[PDB]
Amino acid sequence: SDVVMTQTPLSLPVSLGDQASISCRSSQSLVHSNGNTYLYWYLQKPGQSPKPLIYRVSNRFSGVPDRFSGSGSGTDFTLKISRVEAEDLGVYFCFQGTHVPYTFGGGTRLEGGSQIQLQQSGPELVRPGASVKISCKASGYTFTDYYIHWVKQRPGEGLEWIGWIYPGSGNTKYNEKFKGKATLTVDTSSSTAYMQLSSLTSEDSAVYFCARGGKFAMDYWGQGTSVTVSS
To answer: Could you tell me which CATH number the domain at 1-115 has?
Structure first.
């Protein structure tokens, strides 16, 4: 009964100047009881963290040019990129934050806030059964004004939302998939968020991102921390 986000097409080869349109469909209505529709779009360029494009269906994040337009309602959503150029190449992901657990679309391959820094700890290489505690040092903004989200990304397997913590209060919310094996904490005095991953298996090998956000979605992302679990 988790919400499934389906994107089409999977791959969209295009030439410069053309129009590009990407579809996202949810298995459930994304209208929240509060009246908002927590549908978001992100772009991930081959070598870095996702970047926020659209919030709440139709709003562009700061620095995102008005040639990006999101539309839709209920269960059907569209991202249109009108005058496509070099820097638009990458994987587009839709994301829903209406229903816990928050879920991502599988991505579409097409072929802002740089004061905010989220500095994550280095790569881990461990044996099965180990635990790791990865950190995320926030700067360039007030740590306790925002949520911190954590996200898992396996190679060619897309994105999974792990949970959030609200640094101001320590309050947490987890994806059932991860609750019990990922523990979120903060140190507000050092503006640092932590995620402890426990009883590691080979399936837990992935890149883990910390990201700033609101209660329903990420905005800016850290650079990721690779965890490799190997015998």
So the answer is: 2.60.40.10
